[PDB]
Amino acid sequence: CDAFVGTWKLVSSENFDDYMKEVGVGFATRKVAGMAKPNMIISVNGDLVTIRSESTFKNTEISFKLGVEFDEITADDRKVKSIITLDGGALVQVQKWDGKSTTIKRKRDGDKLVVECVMKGVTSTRVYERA
């Protein structure tokens, strides 16, 4: 996942509130998520990949190996089982909890890192560029 390594800053967000509503995120948390201007910092050390999200409002970090299930507490405070794979050159994360699932796809497109979050056909698109 060398293509993904770096510090990325948010440049656009589309349909994020509706996505969060579909997942079940509370009103106040959606408000915070909507106004935050996060950086996404991706690094690799051998077979261990780390993805950090940082803003004045919230900091999250996951460290994982491709294709190995791990436990995660999400930014919106869900406890999920996550599996991340490299699928068509994209990093694809599936989160499962309470019999539900959502997919977060991170892809490289030109100079952009495009993040697509989908649940039950509701999709948010958040685009990042190098900081």
Ligand X SMILES: COC(=O)c1sc(-c2cccs2)cc1NC(=O)/C=C\C(=O)O
Residue pair 52/59 in contact (Cβ under 8 Å)? The answer is: yes
Which residue in 64, 82, 93, 126 binds ligand X (CB under 6 A)? 126
Q: Binding to ligand X (CB under 6 A): which residues in 69-88?
A: 75-76
* Contacts with ligand X, 102-121, as mask; x by CB under 6 A: -------------x-x----
Considering the complex, what minimum distance in angstroms separates the CB of residue 33 from ligand X? 4
Q: Write the DSSP symbol of residue 96.
A: E
Element of type H or E holding 7: strand 6-14
Q: Residue count at the site for ligand X (CB under 6 A)?
A: 16
Using a 10 angstrom Cβ sphere, with 0-12 exposed, 13-18 middle and 19 or more buried, the burial of residue 120 is exposed
**Which residues sit opposite 100 in a β-bridge?**
97
User: Using CB under 6 A as the criterion, which residues of the chain lie in contact with ligand X when the complex forms?
Assistant: 20, 23, 25, 29, 32-33, 36, 40, 53, 57-58, 75-76, 115, 117, 126
